[PDB]
């Protein structure tokens, strides 16, 4: 990474990043199967199995309540409205039955929906299996204080996924803000990334940054159908990788004239990538996220701009107020300190206390020169790479 300090504008350009552009959304539908708990009943009073059974039963009822309320009258409102649309499609009667039948023979299928879209469809059957073959028989005619403790404790550990799913959806009106491991385990995430409609290289990159894949998605409850729970998970599709990107950070550049401040400030800070078609600008910090040397940007947040990176002759984006703003702006490889208007600005080390006081007027600190820069008892920790 090459960070260059442009002193005329109080700015940094940090160069040589590599892009990962979200270009679409993959949809994975889940059927978590609880199995027939309706006819299982305990009549021998307090019991670990009775409580975990009652807990399952009441989770089913809670989810039925949550789905009832869900009535048409790190996720963009854009991303979520997209997902709600997909979910309306899947919540039809026909479509649910289609998916249930697609998963009769196998554990995992590519179901097509009535509009044409293809969705992955997983069956999570561990609880129904445990309930149908292990628990129903160990409950001998309504008696749950079974002497087999290993069985009891297994029930307790087998419905953990279901109840956690029911908690996450019920606590968010059926739209979780991100993707817990109860919604989609890491196995299932990797399996679903590998089936995405893109080429093997983007799939490779995604599988190397699974956690970043998961950060950008979310879940929507579909409904409760019998003793099964249908929900969906939207994974991001990084359909385009490895175009070059740079970040521009800046602060105010004022000259002082005995009372009067003659200021300058760039208004083009953010992330840029020269990918194919245009040069693209991502203006908000939430928009692009770095891991190591790759920068992951939501293409929905992109503005197209022209060729640039001069000083300013061309018409660069900059300000000309008479008003100062003292502040710190942390670049990938350091800091830009903008000191004005009666305030005390300094460098700091985590070993040696106060390394070098700073002078009024925008200084630039490489991160190998400090661990800290403060402006009047507000302390900024520099980024270390």
């Amino acid at each position, epitope marked *: 990474l090459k960070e260059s300090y442009l002193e005329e504008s109080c700015s940094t350009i940090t160069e040589g990043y590599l892009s990962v552009l979200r270009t679409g959304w993959y949809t994975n539908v889940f059927t978590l199967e609880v199995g027939d708990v309706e006819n299982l009943t305990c009549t021998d009073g*307090p019991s670990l199995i009775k409580t975990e059974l*009652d807990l399952t039963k009441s989770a089913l009822r809670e989810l039925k309540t949550v789905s009832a309320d869900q009535l048409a009258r790190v996720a963009t409102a854009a991303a979520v409205t997209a997902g709600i649309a997909i979910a309306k499609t899947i919540r039809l009667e026909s479509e649910v039955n289609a998916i249930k039948g697609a998963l009769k023979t196998t554990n995992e299928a590519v179901s097509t929906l009535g509009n044409g879209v293809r969705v992955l469809a997983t069956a999570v059957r561990e609880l129904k299996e445990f309930v149908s073959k292990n628990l129903t028989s160990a409950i001998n005619k309504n008696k749950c204080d079974i002497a087999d403790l290993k069985m009891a404790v297994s029930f307790s550990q087998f419905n953990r996924r279901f109840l956690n799913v029911v908690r996450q959806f019920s606590d968010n009106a059926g739209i979780t803000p991100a993707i817990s491991l109860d919604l989609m385990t890491d196995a299932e995430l990797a399996r679903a990334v590998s089936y995405m409609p893109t080429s093997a290289g983007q799939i490779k990159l995604m599988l190397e940054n699974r956690a970043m894949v998961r950060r950008k998605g979310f879940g929507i409850l579909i409904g409760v159908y019998g003793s099964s729970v249908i929900y969906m998970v939207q994974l991001p599709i990084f359909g385009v990788i490895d175009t070059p990107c740079w970040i521009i950070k800046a602060a105010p550049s004022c000259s002082e004239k005995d009372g009067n401040y003659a200021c300058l400030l760039r208004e083009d800070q953010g992330w840029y990538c020269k990918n194919a078609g245009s040069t693209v600008y991502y203006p908000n910090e939430k928009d692009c996220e770095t891991r190591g040397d790759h920068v992951f940007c939501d293409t929905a947040a992109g503005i197209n701009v022209a060729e640039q990176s001069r000083e300013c002759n061309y018409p660069c984006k900059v300000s000309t107020g008479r008003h100062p703003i003292s502040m710190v702006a942390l670049s990938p490889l350091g800091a830009l300190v903008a000191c004005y208007k009666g305030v005390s600005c300094s460098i700091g080390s985590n070993r040696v206390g106060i390394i070098k006081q700073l002078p009024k007027g925008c200084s630039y600190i490489t991160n190998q020169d400090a661990d800290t820069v403060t402006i009047d008892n507000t302390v900024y920790q520099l980024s270390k790479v």
Partner: antibody, heavy 115, light 108 residues
Framework: QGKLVESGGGVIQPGRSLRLSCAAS????????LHWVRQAPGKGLEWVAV????????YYADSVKGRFTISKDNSKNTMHLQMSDLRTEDTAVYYC????????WGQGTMVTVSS | DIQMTQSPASLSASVGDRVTITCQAS??????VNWYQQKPGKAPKLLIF???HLERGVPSRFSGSGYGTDFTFTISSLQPEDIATYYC?????????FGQGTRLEIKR
């Protein structure tokens, strides 16, 4: 089994607030939700509100939607109903019931809404 | 929401006879119906859960039938201490709801 004990019913003026309480012993209060249901002298049983075992989800009968609030404290094993803006219709015996294992009710307290 | 509607309004019958209360659910709640007995100035007592299961120590006489929307509580031979009011309750989901109740009276 264990039991449910309600407390804090009494007389209260029409438009003030009152906080009812329910004390759990003898069962795994942390893994059961509970209900409040009331019956006005004479009349039948009417469901009032429910809270889930986690304490983080609540639902109300429309009678008392917007005035009553239900809460659950697993630390002290106890559930509460905070009634506000009481009307004369609220006069009733207030009952604590365990959800999903419905055999266990409290004995009641009388909330008498009179000036 | 979900409406239980309980019949008859009230019931009078001589000690020994056959009592039959019926509850009808506004929608199909499948077997999620309890039957409660309550004697005046006392907390209700659960007799039948899951529309047909007798609670423990409840006598041979009591029985529940139903699946779907139409349920039936039944006593075979009424006895003195069976005089009370009976309520059905549904628990299809978290929003439970009760029937209007039915009042039993020894006939004379």
């Amino acid at each position: 089994q264990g039991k449910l004990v309600e407390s804090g019913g009494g007389v209260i003026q029409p438009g003030r607030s009152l906080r009812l309480s329910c004390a759990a012993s003898g069962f795994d209060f942390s893994r059961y939700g509970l209900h409040w249901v009331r019956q006005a002298p004479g009349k039948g049983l009417e469901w009032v509100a429910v809270i889930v075992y986690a304490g983080s989800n609540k639902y109300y009968a429309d009678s008392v939607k917007g005035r009553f609030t239900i809460s659950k404290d697993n630390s002290k094993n106890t559930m509460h109903l905070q009634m506000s803006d009481l009307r004369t219709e609220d006069t009733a015996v207030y009952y604590c019931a365990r959800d999903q294992a419905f055999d266990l009710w409290g004995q009641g307290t009388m909330v008498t809404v009179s000036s | 929401d979900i409406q239980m509607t309980q019949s008859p309004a009230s019931l009078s019958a001589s000690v020994g006879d056959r009592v039959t209360i019926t509850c009808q659910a506004s929608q199909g709640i499948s077997r999620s119906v309890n039957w409660y007995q309550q004697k005046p100035g006392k907390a209700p007592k659960l007799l039948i859960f899951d529309a047909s299961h007798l609670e423990r120590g409840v006598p041979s006489r009591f029985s529940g039938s139903g699946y779907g929307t139409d349920f039936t509580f039944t006593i075979s031979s009424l006895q003195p201490e069976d005089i009370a009011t009976y309520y059905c309750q549904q628990y299809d989901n978290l929003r439970i709801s009760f029937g209007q109740g039915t009042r039993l009276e020894i006939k004379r």
